Ligand binder design. Structure first.
Ligand SMILES: [Zn+2]
Ligand SMILES: [Zn+2]
Ligand SMILES: [Zn+2]
Length: 69
């Protein structure tokens, strides 16, 4: 059940827009990021200039982009 790369392995650039936050497209620490099971994307809670600091750690939740659905 280890993490897998979707558009990174196929893309020579090896960007992790999916596994990593699309804003950074990789070059980040997915351990401090939360993944959305519905969108399977990372949130910037810690990438914004100011860090959210709460870091739920649960990593199991939905991002506000799809929660409004
Ligand atoms: Zn990836
Ligand atoms: Zn980022
Ligand atoms: Zn989502």
């Amino acid at each position: 059940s280890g993490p897998s790369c979707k558009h990174c392995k196929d893309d020579v650039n090896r960007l992790c827009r999916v596994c990593a936050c699309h804003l950074c497209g990789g070059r980040q620490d997915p351990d401090k990021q939360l993944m959305c099971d519905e969108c399977d994307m990372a949130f910037h809670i810690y990438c914004l200039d100011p860090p959210l600091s709460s870091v739920p750690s649960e990593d199991e939740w939905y991002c506000p982009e799809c929660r409004n659905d």
